[PDB]
Ligand binder design. Structure first.
Ligand SMILES: Nc1ncnc2c1ncn2[C@@H]1O[C@H](COP(=O)(O)OP(=O)(O)O)[C@@H](O)[C@H]1O
Ligand SMILES: Nc1ncnc2c1ncn2[C@@H]1O[C@H](COP(=O)(O)OP(=O)(O)O)[C@@H](O)[C@H]1O
Ligand SMILES: Nc1ncnc2c1ncn2[C@@H]1O[C@H](COP(=O)(O)OP(=O)(O)O)[C@@H](O)[C@H]1O
Lengths: 659, 392, 110
């Protein structure tokens, strides 16, 4: 319980660095730079360099995906660490590449791939190990085949590497490029629960033989058709170590009740014959078409053979079924009940923070440039799902191919070489490919996190007591923000969640006037979209559409009933905005619907930005058009092309016509 | 990298004039009027007259569709130019017409077709070449069969042309009247992207064997039912050099799940057996009727056999599928996703500038008059697509 | 034109919005915007027009311009930030260039 560490995820995806807690390293006589022997299971062991990282837990150790596969261990297992002082540098180490990775790529694995790996990098060696080198639009696994000083060699600039030879084979070594948790970004929190409910029925299939508890059995994934579904299940079963069969919807419908009734039974029989079963019902929208009263006799039996095959079967037999649909409202209601799909999982469009991680993952095999600032691209990529974030990663890597052809001609079948690596991908390959931009998820209810500073407010002493830490031993839950326009009513609730650390949903009046108003309308889709997100603030601007001048005066009443009931939720709040508080029906003001009213001294301080092309105030006070005078001041950019930034003589020309 | 020029499109569709950059011609000791020997690939070569056009790029050369086919090269290839001073005029050159072009047309190929071609036109000759003459509502290809001064003759008013003979055959010479980029007008900019994403999976099928990048695989054409769809894909595969199978929607629906399930599989298997595959799903509106909850069991399987046949197949196997519909909102949403039809292309009605180019293309085999000002017609032709521009 | 019978989200209204989305850059001019007021989906399509206008601010390379003559019955919703952010009216009678100078025959006093 003191040396027994639990393997965890790696902050840095390095095959040699494993991070640990320093107070635990203070117990086991270790500091940075020293090497440690780590043996996990099946008598296998490797050896790596430690580091003092206080981020990890005390009884937990950080291990990388390739470090995990070398010990024949997987995440959630206990490993033992031993001090390794008896180690010395090595003379010769023979490195052969792996068969399943040298696909057409040729040249010299040492000059292109292996040199940058070990250049000034001091790394330990095993006699029988495998490892991955990400470079040149791909990744070629290598194998250590010999070790000169016993089995614990250490590479250094003083080392002779005879990489000459044949592509060695692999032996029960799962592809180190297979899907993993380090390959799924933008849904870290979404992976928390899915990894808290499949962690036991798959990794610990012991208690579930002798416990009367009914374990989770029916998982229902949903989200965007663009991305975020197949990998959520692929990165789990391929990483947790579970048998993975993914039944595709379109194939089943391609029969005449032949492989429609068989593959449904057979794959349900096949997955159960193995102990860890993960069944991915891809395109369940095509199989289950909600309550389709007008259809053919095959959909009335392909869904009729599915429910009976999961309530009778899939009962403590260590089988976790996983559905996948574009919308959780186009499949039969009898799918989500008890035992079958009682679990549901939201896959939302990645926020600005989540877009950056997935950008990193896919942009790893490439060699980029320092002018490339993927952070700036990670901001202006709303409406972009993991597919489109990978779709431009192709058009960004492929634009570098034609733009740098030139001398290379008469391409051989295996012409790739060191030219493939070091292929610097300029930022223009992004911009020109992003010039033909094409997003997908634009009409969606976006879940994200506000990244705006509270300094740019200049308010009127907003009482801090309009907040709570969910620690009490009833509280008001309805507030509205009215007053003049521009004073801050739109950006007001944005900076509140900056300190509260909660998701937000910006909704407008005519947004609820969606043609898809025919109870679980978008109105209720938006309500329940923020129900899973806990806590979540529902901001509503343009609420002036409450009055008159079909379902004209409807949707309001529709909005009314849904507001109540949320008072028991406690961890959810509703805020609105308006400018003409007269034509609004006073219904919302009623207790429960809303329970507070906030207006909007003198002109307050306001924090600007863009302080680089700036040039050096409160007297002008003698917001409304705060940004309007700012952008026009930047628009007054002197074009004396044939130094100057901002100036005063340009302000006086702006207030001549403003209002 | 200095003599290696990249072939490009021709501003003038002349079989003998090839334009180049003058600063590059300043490097290689050349000015207007002089002749150059251009050998491309497969040891084949011709010879043409250059000209000083600053419009082309420095490392790029302008070549016409017929100039391109004679060197067995296609656009996007590197050719080598050599100075050809050792050339002289010719005495006799025998010109026979091509079999696939003398269809019913008769009379005298010299008095009608060959004379206006060489009247005051000084053009070089190869011993084995083919060329096209646009005239008289059609176009009849001709073949040079002999060359009196070695293999580099030059025609002139002083030349004896015995055109008397039989219609010679053709041999692996693609129809010089086949569809090309010079036959598609009004959508030049629309062709820019479609030629920036199929240029690699078809012309350079090398890296896509050893690169983890997922290339473009699903192209979704759309626009008007009148025009602008079949040629956008015909002018690419027939010009880039790709196998071209066009599955028509109406034929598939004409079965009883016989050739409905077979031709879908078989043509998807057939196109993959060849390396450059361009699949045109014509009338995909008829095959995929959006999300049709009220229909028969055949549309629920002909679209169910298509999606499974493109996400499992059509994966780095050098296959570019191309859909074609009247509206991009009458087909299933599961068609456009990831890998399948993630690319989409707009074909709009040609603007007043685009209407004029397509008018020129079709009005070439004709002999017009100087009172005909196709520019004035090119203005008042809104609501006219390439079909109606060809219908009149 | 937006009052097309084919108003039943991806109506012609949204077909027109996305038609100019591929074309980059593209200017969306809108005349006859005086149909905003009253006198079914009568007062609709406006709200439909409202939601689609926002979001285009991140596009950066797209602009929206409108036209009207009676700026009173127009719901002030569009004037809100993001939907619209500038107002332009329309000295004396200015010079105007004519054409058809061939069948012409040879002013400002009029
Ligand atoms: N959340 C994510 N994180 C990282 N990559 C992703 C994510 N979602 C999608 N991708 C990438 O997008 C590609 C296609 O998305 P996919 O998961 O097939 O869509 P779906 O599962 O919704 O059909 C995948 O190959 C994957 O690499
Ligand atoms: N302290 C501030 N208060 C209000 N607005 C500010 C402040 N500082 C900057 N602004 C700018 O003024 C704008 C006012 O919000 P806006 O989007 O116009 O919505 P509304 O006009 O409906 O309140 C913001 O977009 C913001 O960019
Ligand atoms: N963009 C274009 N440029 C030149 N010619 C065109 C164009 N579009 C159509 N045409 C002409 O119109 C004829 C018929 O149009 P077609 O391409 O068959 O229509 P679609 O492909 O939309 O069914 C073709 O033979 C072609 O010559």
């Amino acid at each position: 319980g003191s040396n027994r560490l639990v393997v965890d995820e790696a902050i840095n995806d390095d095959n040699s660095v494993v991070s640990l807690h320093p107070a635990t390293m203070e117990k086991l006589q270790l500091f940075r730079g020293d090497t440690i022997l780590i043996k996990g299971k099946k008598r296998k062991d490797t050896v790596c360099i430690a580091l003092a990282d206080e981020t990890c837990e005390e009884p937990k150790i950080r291990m990388n995906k390739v470090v995990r596969s070398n010990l024949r261990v997987r995440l959630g297992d206990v490993i033992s660490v031993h001090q390794c002082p008896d180690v010395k540098y090595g003379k010769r180490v023979h490195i052969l590449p792996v068969d399943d990775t040298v696909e057409g790529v040729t040249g010299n694995l040492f000059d292109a791939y292996l040199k940058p790996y070990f250049l000034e990098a001091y790394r330990p060696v095993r006699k029988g190990d495998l490892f991955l080198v990400r470079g040149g639009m791909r990744s070629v696994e290598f194998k250590v085949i010999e070790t000169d000083p016993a089995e614990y060699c250490v590479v250094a600039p003083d080392t002779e590497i005879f990489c000459e030879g044949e592509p060695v084979k692999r032996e029960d070594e799962e592809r180190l490029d297979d899907v993993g948790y380090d390959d799924v970004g933008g849904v870290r929190k979404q992976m928390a629960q899915i990894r808290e409910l499949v962690e036991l029925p798959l990794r610990h299939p012991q208690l579930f033989k002798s416990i009367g508890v009914k374990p989770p059995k029916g998982i229902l994934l949903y989200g965007p058709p663009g991305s975020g579904k197949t990998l959520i299940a692929r990165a789990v079963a391929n990483e947790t170590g579970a048998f993975f069969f993914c039944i595709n919807g379109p194939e089943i419908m391609s029969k005449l009740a032949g492989e429609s009734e068989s593959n449904l039974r057979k794959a349900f029989e096949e997955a159960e014959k193995n102990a860890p079963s993960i069944i991915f019902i891809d395109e369940i929208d095509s199989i289950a078409p909600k309550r389709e009263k007008t259809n053919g006799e095959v959909e009335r039996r392909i869904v009729s053979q599915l429910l009976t095959l999961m309530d009778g079967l899939k009962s403590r037999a260590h089988v976790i079924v996983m559905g996948a649909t574009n919308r959780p409202n186009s499949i039969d209601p009898a799918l989500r009940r008890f035992g079958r799909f009682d679990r549901e999982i939201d896959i939302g469009v990645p926020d600005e923070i989540g877009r950056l991680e997935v950008l990193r993952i896919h942009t790893k095999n490439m060699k980029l440039a320092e002018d490339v600032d993927l952070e700036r691209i990670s901001k202006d990529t709303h409406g972009y799902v993991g597919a489109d974030l990978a779709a431009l990663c192709t058009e960004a890597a492929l634009q570098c191919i034609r733009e740098k052809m030139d001398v290379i001609d008469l391409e051989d079948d295996s012409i790739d070489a060191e030219i493939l690596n070091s292929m610097a991908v300029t930022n223009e390959h992004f911009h020109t490919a992003l010039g033909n931009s094409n997003p997908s998820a634009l009409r969606e209810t976006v879940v994200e996190v506000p990244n705006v500073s509270w300094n740019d407010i200049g308010g009127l002493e907003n009482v801090k007591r309009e907040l709570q830490e969910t620690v009490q031993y009833s509280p008001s839950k309805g507030v509205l923000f009215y007053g003049p326009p521009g004073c801050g009513k739109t950006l007001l609730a944005k900076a509140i969640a900056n300190e509260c650390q909660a998701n937000f949903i910006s909704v407008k009046g005519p947004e609820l006037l969606t043609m898809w108003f025919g109870s679980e309308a978008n109105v209720r889709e938006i309500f329940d979209k923020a129900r899973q997100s806990a806590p979540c603030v529902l901001f509503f601007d343009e609420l002036d559409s409450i009055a008159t001048q079909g379902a004209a005066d409807r949707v309001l009443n529709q909005l009314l009933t849904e507001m109540d009931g949320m008072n028991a939720k406690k961890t959810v709040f509703i805020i609105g905005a308006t400018n003409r508080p007269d034509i609004i029906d006073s219904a919302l003001l009623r207790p429960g619907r809303l329970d507070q009213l906030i207006y909007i001294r003198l002109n307050i301080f306001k924090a600007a930005l863009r302080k680089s092309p700036i040039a050096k105030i409160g007297a002008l006070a003698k917001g409304a058009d705060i940004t309007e005078i700012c952008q026009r001041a930047c628009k007054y950019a002197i074009r004396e092309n044939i130094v100057s930034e901002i100036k005063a003589a340009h302000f006086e020309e702006s207030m001549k016509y403003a209002r």
